[PDB]
Coordinates of C-alpha atoms and ligand atoms in Angstrom, one line a residue:
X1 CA -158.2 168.5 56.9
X2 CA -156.3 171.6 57.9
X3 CA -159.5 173.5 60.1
X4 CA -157.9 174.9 62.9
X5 CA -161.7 175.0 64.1
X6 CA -163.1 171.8 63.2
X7 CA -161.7 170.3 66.6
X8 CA -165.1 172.4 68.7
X9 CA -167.9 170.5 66.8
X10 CA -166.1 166.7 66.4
X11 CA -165.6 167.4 70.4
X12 CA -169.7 168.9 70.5
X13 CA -170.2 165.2 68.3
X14 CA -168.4 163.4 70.9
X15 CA -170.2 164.7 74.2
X16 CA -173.6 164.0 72.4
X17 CA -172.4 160.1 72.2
X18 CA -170.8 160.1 76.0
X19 CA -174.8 161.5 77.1
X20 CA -176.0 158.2 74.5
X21 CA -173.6 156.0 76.6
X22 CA -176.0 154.7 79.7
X23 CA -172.2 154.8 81.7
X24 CA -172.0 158.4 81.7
X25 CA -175.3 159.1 83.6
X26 CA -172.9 159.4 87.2
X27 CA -170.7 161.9 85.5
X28 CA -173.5 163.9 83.9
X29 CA -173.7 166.5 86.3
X30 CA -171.7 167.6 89.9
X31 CA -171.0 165.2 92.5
X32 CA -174.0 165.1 95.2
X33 CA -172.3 166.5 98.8
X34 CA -175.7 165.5 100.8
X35 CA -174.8 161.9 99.1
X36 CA -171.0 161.7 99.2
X37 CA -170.7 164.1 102.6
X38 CA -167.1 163.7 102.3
X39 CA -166.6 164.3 98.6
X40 CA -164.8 167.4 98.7
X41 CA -162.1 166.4 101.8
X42 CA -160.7 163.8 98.9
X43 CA -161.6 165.8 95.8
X44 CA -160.2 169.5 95.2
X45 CA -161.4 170.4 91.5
X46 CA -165.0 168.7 90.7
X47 CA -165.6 168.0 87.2
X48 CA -168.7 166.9 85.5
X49 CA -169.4 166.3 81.0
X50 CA -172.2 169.5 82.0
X51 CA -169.4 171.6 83.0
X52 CA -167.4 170.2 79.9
X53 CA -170.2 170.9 77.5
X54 CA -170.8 174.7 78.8
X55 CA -167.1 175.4 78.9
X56 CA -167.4 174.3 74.7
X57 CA -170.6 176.1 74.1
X58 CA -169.6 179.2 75.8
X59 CA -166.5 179.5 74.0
X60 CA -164.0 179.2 76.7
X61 CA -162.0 176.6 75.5
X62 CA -159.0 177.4 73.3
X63 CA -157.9 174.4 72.1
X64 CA -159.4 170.7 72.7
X65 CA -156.1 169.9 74.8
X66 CA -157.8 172.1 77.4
X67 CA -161.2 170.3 77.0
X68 CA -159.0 166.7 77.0
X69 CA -157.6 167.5 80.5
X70 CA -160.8 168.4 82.1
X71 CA -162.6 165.4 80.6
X72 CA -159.5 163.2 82.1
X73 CA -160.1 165.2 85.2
X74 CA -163.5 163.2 85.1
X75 CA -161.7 160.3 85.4
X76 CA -159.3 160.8 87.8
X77 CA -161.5 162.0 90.3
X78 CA -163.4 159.0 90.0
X79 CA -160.4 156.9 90.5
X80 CA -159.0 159.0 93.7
X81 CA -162.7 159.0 95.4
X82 CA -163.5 155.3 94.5
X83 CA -163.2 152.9 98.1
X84 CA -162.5 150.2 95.3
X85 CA -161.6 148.9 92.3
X86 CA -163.9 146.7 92.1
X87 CA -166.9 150.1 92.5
X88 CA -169.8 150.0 90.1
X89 CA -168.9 153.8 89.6
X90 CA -165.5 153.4 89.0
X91 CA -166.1 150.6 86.5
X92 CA -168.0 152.6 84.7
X93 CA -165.4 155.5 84.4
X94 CA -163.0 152.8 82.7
X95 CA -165.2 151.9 80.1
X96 CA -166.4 155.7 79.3
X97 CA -162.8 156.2 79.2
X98 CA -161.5 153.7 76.9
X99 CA -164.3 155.1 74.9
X100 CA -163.3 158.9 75.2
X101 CA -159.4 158.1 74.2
X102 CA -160.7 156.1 71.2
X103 CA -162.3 159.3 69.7
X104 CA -160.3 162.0 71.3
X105 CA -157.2 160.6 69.7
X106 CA -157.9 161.7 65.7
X107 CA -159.5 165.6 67.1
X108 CA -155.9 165.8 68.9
X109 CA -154.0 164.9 65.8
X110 CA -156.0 166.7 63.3
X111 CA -156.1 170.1 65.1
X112 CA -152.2 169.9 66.4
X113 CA -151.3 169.3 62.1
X114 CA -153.7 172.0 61.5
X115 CA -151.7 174.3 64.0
X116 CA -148.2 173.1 62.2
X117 CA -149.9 173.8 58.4
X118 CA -150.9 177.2 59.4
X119 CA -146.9 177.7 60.7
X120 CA -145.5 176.3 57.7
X121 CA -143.9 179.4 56.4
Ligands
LIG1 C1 -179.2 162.9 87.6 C2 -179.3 163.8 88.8 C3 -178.1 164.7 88.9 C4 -180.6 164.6 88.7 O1 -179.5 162.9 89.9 C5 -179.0 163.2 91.1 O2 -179.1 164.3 91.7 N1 -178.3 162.2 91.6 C6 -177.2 161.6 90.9 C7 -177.3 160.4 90.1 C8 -176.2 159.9 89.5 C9 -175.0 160.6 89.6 C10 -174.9 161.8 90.3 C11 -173.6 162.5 90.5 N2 -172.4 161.6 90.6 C12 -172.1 161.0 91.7 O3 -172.9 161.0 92.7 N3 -170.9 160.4 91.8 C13 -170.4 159.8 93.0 C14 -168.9 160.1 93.2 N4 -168.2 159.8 92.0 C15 -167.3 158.8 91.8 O4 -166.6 158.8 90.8 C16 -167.2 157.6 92.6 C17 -166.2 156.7 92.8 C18 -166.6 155.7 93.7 C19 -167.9 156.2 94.1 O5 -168.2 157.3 93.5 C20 -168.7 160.5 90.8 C21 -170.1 160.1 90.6 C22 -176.0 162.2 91.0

């Protein structure tokens, strides 16, 4: 396919199955501050797949690079906050992970040939 749009619902496709996975229920909305007091000393940029999916919906994501990084974000918050690497939490970002780079991989490709097609001339 050479949709330069097609990327927005196969990444709309993809949320809906990381809300089906029972390991994204942590990451579902914002970190809780009353909870995790000292969230934000360790953690600058909060991100949660809520943010993510209004960011799509609205229509401020460009490309679904930018949506890529914030969902890695995700992720690497998890890691720099975890005490552990042997946290239930954190375990659960791996998986939901490994599962997000699965998919993500064919949306990058497709859209970035899409991009070169529409340069061709
Ligand atoms: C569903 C509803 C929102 C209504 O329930 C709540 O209000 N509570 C609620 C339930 C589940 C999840 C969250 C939000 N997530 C959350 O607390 N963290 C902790 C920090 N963190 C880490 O990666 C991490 C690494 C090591 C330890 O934590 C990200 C996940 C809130």
């Amino acid at each position: 396919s050479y949709d330069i749009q097609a990327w927005k619902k196969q990444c709309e496709e993809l949320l809906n199955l990381i809300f089906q996975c029972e390991d994204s229920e942590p990451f579902r909305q914002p970190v809780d501050l009353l909870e995790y007091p000292d969230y934000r000393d360790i953690i600058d940029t909060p991100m949660d797949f809520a943010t993510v999916r209004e960011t799509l919906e609205a229509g401020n994501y460009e490309s679904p690079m930018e949506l890529c990084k914030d969902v890695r974000l995700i992720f690497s918050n998890s890691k720099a906050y975890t005490p552990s690497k042997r946290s239930r939490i954190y375990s659960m970002s791996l998986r939901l992970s490994a599962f997000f780079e699965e998919h993500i991989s064919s949306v990058l490709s497709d859209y970035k040939s899409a991009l070169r097609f529409h340069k061709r001339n």
